[PDB]
Design an enzyme around this catalytic site. Structure first.
Site, PDB file in Angstrom:
ATOM      1  N   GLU A   1     -35.024 -29.056   9.619  1.00 31.03           N
ATOM      2  CA  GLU A   1     -36.191 -29.072  10.493  1.00 31.03           C
ATOM      3  C   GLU A   1     -37.440 -28.473   9.827  1.00 31.03           C
ATOM      4  O   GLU A   1     -38.021 -27.479  10.282  1.00 31.03           O
ATOM      5  CB  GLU A   1     -35.848 -28.413  11.847  1.00 31.03           C
TER       6      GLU A   1
ATOM      7  N   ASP B   1     -32.918 -21.812  14.740  1.00 35.03           N
ATOM      8  CA  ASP B   1     -32.632 -21.587  16.153  1.00 35.03           C
ATOM      9  C   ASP B   1     -31.453 -20.615  16.337  1.00 35.03           C
ATOM     10  O   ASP B   1     -30.290 -21.010  16.411  1.00 35.03           O
ATOM     11  CB  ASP B   1     -32.366 -22.934  16.823  1.00 35.03           C
TER      12      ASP B   1
ATOM     13  N   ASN C   1     -38.944 -16.074  24.718  1.00 33.04           N
ATOM     14  CA  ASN C   1     -37.559 -16.365  24.376  1.00 33.04           C
ATOM     15  C   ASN C   1     -37.175 -17.741  24.891  1.00 33.04           C
ATOM     16  O   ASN C   1     -37.886 -18.315  25.709  1.00 33.04           O
ATOM     17  CB  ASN C   1     -36.628 -15.283  24.938  1.00 33.04           C
TER      18      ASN C   1
ATOM     19  N   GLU D   1     -26.200 -33.395  13.144  1.00 30.77           N
ATOM     20  CA  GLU D   1     -26.012 -32.756  14.458  1.00 30.77           C
ATOM     21  C   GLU D   1     -25.880 -33.840  15.520  1.00 30.77           C
ATOM     22  O   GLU D   1     -26.669 -34.784  15.533  1.00 30.77           O
ATOM     23  CB  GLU D   1     -27.187 -31.832  14.809  1.00 30.77           C
TER      24      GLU D   1
ATOM     25  N   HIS E   1     -39.410 -24.988  11.351  1.00 29.98           N
ATOM     26  CA  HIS E   1     -39.479 -25.772  12.602  1.00 29.98           C
ATOM     27  C   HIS E   1     -40.782 -25.564  13.397  1.00 29.98           C
ATOM     28  O   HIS E   1     -41.318 -26.508  13.978  1.00 29.98           O
ATOM     29  CB  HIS E   1     -38.277 -25.422  13.493  1.00 29.98           C
TER      30      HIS E   1
ATOM     31  N   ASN F   1     -24.559 -22.917  22.577  1.00 29.03           N
ATOM     32  CA  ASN F   1     -24.253 -24.356  22.452  1.00 29.03           C
ATOM     33  C   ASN F   1     -22.853 -24.618  21.911  1.00 29.03           C
ATOM     34  O   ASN F   1     -22.570 -25.719  21.413  1.00 29.03           O
ATOM     35  CB  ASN F   1     -25.227 -25.079  21.505  1.00 29.03           C
TER      36      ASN F   1
ATOM     37  N   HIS G   1     -28.033 -22.694   9.256  1.00 22.74           N
ATOM     38  CA  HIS G   1     -28.784 -23.548   8.314  1.00 22.74           C
ATOM     39  C   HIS G   1     -29.196 -22.689   7.122  1.00 22.74           C
ATOM     40  O   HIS G   1     -30.389 -22.436   6.906  1.00 22.74           O
ATOM     41  CB  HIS G   1     -30.049 -24.134   8.957  1.00 22.74           C
TER      42      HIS G   1
ATOM     43  N   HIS H   1     -22.797 -21.474  12.832  1.00 25.64           N
ATOM     44  CA  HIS H   1     -23.599 -20.303  12.480  1.00 25.64           C
ATOM     45  C   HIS H   1     -22.678 -19.110  12.248  1.00 25.64           C
ATOM     46  O   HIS H   1     -21.558 -19.075  12.760  1.00 25.64           O
ATOM     47  CB  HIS H   1     -24.573 -19.951  13.607  1.00 25.64           C
TER      48      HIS H   1
ATOM     49  N   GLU I   1     -36.067 -23.359   6.875  1.00 27.24           N
ATOM     50  CA  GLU I   1     -36.390 -24.030   8.111  1.00 27.24           C
ATOM     51  C   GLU I   1     -37.754 -23.561   8.574  1.00 27.24           C
ATOM     52  O   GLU I   1     -37.983 -22.365   8.736  1.00 27.24           O
ATOM     53  CB  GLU I   1     -35.346 -23.795   9.212  1.00 27.24           C
TER      54      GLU I   1
ATOM     55  N   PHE J   1     -30.456 -21.207  25.525  1.00 26.56           N
ATOM     56  CA  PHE J   1     -30.385 -22.212  24.463  1.00 26.56           C
ATOM     57  C   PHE J   1     -29.697 -21.751  23.179  1.00 26.56           C
ATOM     58  O   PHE J   1     -29.459 -22.566  22.289  1.00 26.56           O
ATOM     59  CB  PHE J   1     -31.766 -22.804  24.154  1.00 26.56           C
TER      60      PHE J   1
END
Ligand SMILES: CC(C)S[C@@H]1O[C@H](CO)[C@H](O)[C@H](O)[C@H]1O
Ligand SMILES: [Mg+2]
Ligand SMILES: [Mg+2]
Ligand code: NA
Ligand code: NA
Ligand code: NA
Ligand code: NA
Ligand code: NA
Lengths: 1015, 210
Positions: free
Chosen positions: A453, A193, A589, A529, A410, A596, A383, A349, A408, A593
């Site tokens: 994930e 993400d 998109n 998390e 996801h 964060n 990640h 990140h 990942e 989000f």
């Protein structure tokens, strides 16, 4: 061959001609340089100006480019992401892959970055030994040529790819050509993400090694039971010709002091029926009373590994920082050096608003200092493996690291579709094994993660066991497939709540307190998390920390996350603004989000960062009579850089204060008895504030740094004295349309049709631009909004429930408006109903009492229909005509605080510029509230009561209607929102309702009272 | 000094409105120069003969949280029945009211007293929107108990068989009542959320004849 084989569409081909992975090498030819970690002449950086040309597909790349520079190429800085230079759009998507899910295939239109460098090589590098090139990070796949000749190929965006260039280079000028593919089969394992970018985004380097060389070394530290004794064990492997005169020396240094040293020739112990390793050796060094490494005290030793001949000629040296620490799980607890950790962690990140995913030292240091200054002790590499310097900095500054494999998946359906598939095991294995081989010597790395994930597949089980087998020194964790599978030593859920179960099928998120005691469960629980810090968030953060301290096996977690992933864009005026998903034409998109963070992209704190700092404090406090009890939560250090400041104030007015030295042992107690305080003059609440202050500067903090605080109510003297009866009496002027109150130069106007105070005058001056009206809604926070369900937006989200019930459209119906003359006051009595399509949502009943003193007492009693969704707020709003520079209040502050995020805030007298009463969230929403306020001052106005307020140049309507902060415009005058009650903000997650029941406005009947007067 | 605190009158005014008479009062309860509680009230009596009582209480933060925030009086009437719209039919308290149901309940007066062998506060009913006793009616959102025994007498009697029905009927109407606890009975056991700790309290009643 290259275009024919299509290695980027084949998960069985992850590299070609790539060298084995290993710990950081510098190939010092001087032992002292190795010892001091000074630059090595044999490790050159190729960062700087390169040539670059963008192409829509690898097929579009001209053959001539292999042989000479393309005239149409531009000169660009490397490392870089080519999206940041404007060659194509960066894409923000969370779960859904940015490409069609059709593994292992990628779009035929596959952006291709053609990098090249003309660079010089010393003749000495080529006459002897081996010259390799190191690409620390290339996203996502690449072919490499040198002087027109094909060298090799590499995948995995987040680990170094190394190639031997010895046979390709000439003395003097050489030319690299690097063809970088945006998409590859690798992309299927890289669905984190975050912005989807590409290019040579980490360092490029040239390393010269001798032909006879150290090819690998592993350092382990084992201890006796009380840690007064350690054995350092170093396994060293060589490549090249074995000769009997070869030796390896491993020396260990504590600063300038050599602690131990050991020498052996090559040849390991018998391993099996075929013998042992002739090309390896293991040295064992004894260490008495080792200075132990921890996040509290990052004691480091230096280990120097010398390859040399018997007569004493150095061939080469390698080296690393050694931290003497033991990580183990025992009796269900994660222990460091025998002691149960409490992880005050954050996910981070690698993000820079200008440089995208390129990291620099300055930014890394800034992040670590900010983390440590805010009582974090731990970081999760979400990640992927990080830029190699990150681990050096965490070794030296002291942070516990979870190193996470770059896997990942996801967006697969189901999530384990690739990770359960043995065809993807080879690609997966490399991302795990090569991470371990690179990073296994860093003391900061205390936990290995298998990725993120990607469901739970049999490939996870294999790779989990591989790690336990090669590195018994570190627990392995993995959250996928339900957070407590056979692939994890640690129950590591994401966004599991404190008390509330979320019983999803197959993968439930149990309450963390409940999870621990599930039948047969023994493992420690550490959230990988939690506390999703998206916009105005961290509601209920205190609730996690209360549980962490109470339950030994709840050993903390990693906040999501450190830094807003906003990017900088420029408008017509050339002014930078903060951009999120969609702002680059990227589609599909996931909009805002990507933001964060506890801090903005430029590392300016969000208000939530202070709540984290307070809740993660290393000192606990209790008050009994005049005694303050200070409990240390430190595991290793004494409080040798701490003193306690205490302060007693009567409604903000200082009455007494002082300082006491703190001498608390790790986990110990200190009792501090306060002197007998002077008797307070007047009525009011006495408040005790304590702060722990660090007098001395450290590597991570400046002198006077405040690390902890707490407040208590002491004695309260209730006001019994009657106010002196004012001689003036207000007059009531009745119209058909208006009730007007006059007192000297003051007028109050009540509109008899609307039932609101529509205007107030002080002589000629108007006070209001909009009437004073009830408000039951807020500009929705990210947590109010959630996510799109499918055929529609999720109907469960707070904003959806408020919209459907008609809260944002409700229109006030006047039920009653009357005026009365009292002995010394005028009483205005009103009643309103808010209705939507025949349904009465809210009833507000008010009395306004204006007396001779010029004060207006407003009493508000509100009924809320039990079957309407609970309102965001119960309060009043108006637009004041005045704009004033300062805002002064007695209440909780100084920073923004909400009912479920106010523990960090202190009660006192606060004074801030008006601009600081607005929080510039990139996605605008309700912001800047301050709770527990007893008195508010702005220009000529004073409000007293027991309320929450925000005050700004932006209406709720504007905040609600504006997608980006840079598009906000200061309105005429000042918008004031004064709430008797405000709903919590939540944030356990940001895609489902997360406001706890005790912070919802569900009581049905609400009372509050205000006094409005001039100052 | 909660049991010994005397009310001191700070203010008592009467006003005439267009259709009502308004009485405004303020009291402070003190013990040894310390103000424990302040009570501010308005009584509004209109042309329908209904007395709306509005009560705002301040409780000093450093005083032990009080057992109740309410009003009491001894009524002259002794009626056979008690009728209420609220939680019932049995005795229920803020931390022991889950079994009670909201409905219209109607019991004999004796049933509104629980004969605990050791006499104490008893017979409360919570979440009550309407109480009816003889010619009286009270409306609002309150907790109440009603019996022939004063809190004083319950406080002074060690056994239930020694209690004597007093003249008329004692009424206790609370805006707020503290939990009873019971996790154990040899240490404080009332949970924080059932203690009266808000500092400022508001409740409203309407007394009328129906
Ligand atoms: C939106 C959820 C269904 S997935 C949710 O999205 C978050 C958004 O920041 C994070 O990426 C979390 O790791 C992820 O679990
Ligand atoms: Mg491939
Ligand atoms: Mg994800
Ligand atoms: Na714990
Ligand atoms: Na995100
Ligand atoms: Na100290
Ligand atoms: Na908005
Ligand atoms: Na008794």
């Amino acid at each position: 061959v290259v275009l024919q084989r299509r290695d980027w569409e084949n998960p069985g081909v992850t590299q070609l001609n790539r060298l084995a992975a290993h710990p950081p090498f510098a190939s010092w030819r001087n032992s002292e340089e190795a010892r001091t970690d000074r630059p090595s002449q044999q490790l050159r950086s190729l960062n700087g100006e390169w040539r670059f040309a963008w192409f829509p597909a690898p097929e579009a790349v001209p053959e001539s480019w292999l042989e000479c520079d393309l005239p149409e190429a531009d000169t660009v800085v490397v490392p870089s992401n080519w999206q940041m230079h404007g060659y194509d759009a960066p894409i923000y998507t969370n779960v859904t892959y940015p490409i069609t899910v059709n593994p292992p295939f990628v779009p035929t239109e596959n952006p291709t970055g053609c990098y090249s460098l003309t660079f010089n090589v010393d003749e000495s590098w080529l006459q002897e030994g081996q010259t390799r090139i190191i690409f620390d990070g290339v996203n996502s796949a690449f072919h490499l040529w040198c002087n027109g000749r094909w060298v090799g190929y590499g995948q995995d965006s987040r680990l170094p790819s190394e190639f031997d260039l010895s046979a390709f280079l000439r003395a003097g000028e050489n030319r690299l050509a690097v063809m970088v593919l945006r998409w590859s089969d690798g992309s299927y394992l890289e669905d984190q993400d975050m912005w989807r970018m590409s290019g040579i985004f980490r360092d490029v380097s040239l390393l010269h090694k001798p032909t006879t060389q150290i090819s690998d070394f592993h350092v382990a530290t084992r201890f006796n039971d009380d840690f007064s004794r350690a054995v350092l064990e170093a396994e060293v492997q060589m490549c090249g010709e074995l000769r009997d005169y070869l030796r390896v020396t491993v020396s260990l240094w504590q600063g300038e002091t050599q602690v131990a040293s050991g020498t052996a020739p090559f040849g390991g112990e018998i391993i099996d029926e075929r013998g042992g390793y002739a090309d390896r050796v293991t040295l064992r060094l004894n260490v008495e009373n080792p200075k132990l490494w921890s996040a509290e005290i990052p004691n480091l030793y230096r280990a120097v590994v010398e390859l040399h001949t018997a007569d004493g000629t150095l061939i080469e040296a390698e080296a690393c920082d050694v931290g003497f620490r033991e990580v183990r799980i025992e009796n269900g607890l994660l222990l460091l050096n025998g002691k149960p950790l409490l992880i005050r962690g954050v996910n981070r990140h690698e993000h820079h608003p200008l440089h995208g995913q390129v990291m620099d030292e300055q930014t890394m240091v800034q992040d670590i200092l900010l983390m440590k200054q805010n009582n974090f002790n731990a970081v999760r590499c979400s990640h992927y493996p990080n830029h190699p310097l990150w681990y050096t900095l965490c070794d030296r500054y002291g942070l516990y690291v979870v190193d996470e494999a770059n896997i990942e998946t996801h967006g697969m359906v189901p999530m384990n579709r690739l990770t359960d598939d043995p065809r993807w095991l080879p690609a997966m294995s490399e991302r795990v094994t090569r991470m371990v081989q690179r990073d296994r010597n860093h003391p900061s790395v205390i936990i290995w993660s298998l990725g993120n994930e990607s469901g739970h597949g049999a490939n996870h089980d294999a790779l989990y066991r591989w790690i336990k087998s090669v590195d018994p020194s570190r627990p392995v964790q993995y959250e996928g497939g339900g957070a407590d599978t056979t692939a994890t030593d640690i129950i590591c859920p994401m966004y599991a709540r404190v008390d509330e179960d979320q019983p999803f099928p197959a993968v439930p998120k149990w309450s963390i307190k409940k999870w621990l005691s599930l039948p047969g469960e023994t493992r420690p629980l550490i959230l990988c998390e939690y506390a999703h810090a998206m916009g105005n968030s961290l509601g209920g953060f205190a609730k996690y920390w209360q549980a962490f301290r109470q339950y030994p096996r709840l050993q903390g977690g990693f906040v999501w996350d450190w830094v807003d992933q906003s990017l900088i864009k420029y408008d017509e005026n050339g002014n930078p603004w903060s951009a999120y998903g969609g702002d680059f034409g990227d589609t599909p998109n996931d909009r805002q989000f990507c933001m964060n963070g506890l801090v903005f992209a430029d590392r300016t704190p969000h208000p939530a960062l202070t709540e984290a700092k307070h809740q993660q404090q290393f000192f606990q406090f209790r008050l009994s009579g005049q005694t303050i009890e200070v409990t240390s939560e430190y595991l290793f250090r004494h409080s040798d850089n701490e003193l306690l400041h205490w302060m007693v104030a009567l409604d903000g007015k200082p009455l007494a204060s002082g300082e006491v030295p703190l001498d608390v042992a790790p986990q110990g107690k200190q009792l501090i008895e306060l002197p007998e305080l002077p008797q307070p003059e007047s009525a009011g609440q006495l408040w005790l504030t304590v702060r722990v202050v660090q007098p001395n500067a450290t590597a991570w903090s400046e002198a006077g740094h405040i690390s902890a605080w707490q407040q208590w109510r002491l004695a309260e003297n209730l006001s019994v004295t009657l106010p002196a009866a004012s001689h003036a009496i207000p007059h009531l002027t009745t119209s058909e349309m208006d009730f007007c109150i006059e007192l000297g130069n003051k007028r109050w106007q009540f509109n008899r049709q609307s039932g609101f105070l529509s205007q107030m005058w002080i002589g000629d001056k108007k006070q209001l631009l909009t009437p004073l009206r009830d408000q039951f809604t807020r500009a929705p926070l990210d947590n109010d909004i959630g996510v799109a369900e499918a055929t529609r937006i999720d109907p469960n989200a707070w904003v959806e429930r408020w919209k459907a019930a008609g809260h944002y459209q409700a229109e006030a119906a006047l039920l009653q408006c009357t005026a009365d003359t009292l002995a010394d006051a005028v009483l205005i009595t009103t009643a309103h109903a808010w209705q939507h399509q025949g349904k009465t949502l809210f009833i507000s009943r008010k009395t306004y009492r204006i007396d001779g003193s010029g004060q207006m007492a407003i009493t508000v009693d509100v009924e809320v229909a039990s079957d309407t969704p609970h309102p965001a707020r119960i309060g009043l709003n108006c637009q004041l005509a005045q704009v004033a520079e300062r805002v002064n209040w007695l209440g909780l502050g100084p920073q923004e605080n909400y009912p479920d995020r106010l523990t960090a805030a202190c009660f006192d007298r606060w004074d801030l510029p008006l601009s600081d009463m607005y929080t510039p969230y990139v996605f605008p929403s309700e912001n800047g509230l301050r709770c527990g306020t007893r008195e508010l001052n702005y220009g000529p106005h004073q409000w007293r009561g027991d309320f929450q307020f925000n005050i700004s140049r932006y209406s709720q309507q504007q905040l609600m209607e504006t997608s980006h902060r840079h598009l906000l415009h200061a309105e005429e005058g000042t918008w004031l929102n004064i709430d008797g009650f405000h709903m919590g903000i939540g944030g356990d997650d940001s895609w489902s309702p997360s406001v706890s029941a005790e912070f919802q406005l569900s009581a049905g009947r609400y009372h509050y009272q205000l006094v409005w007067c001039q100052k």
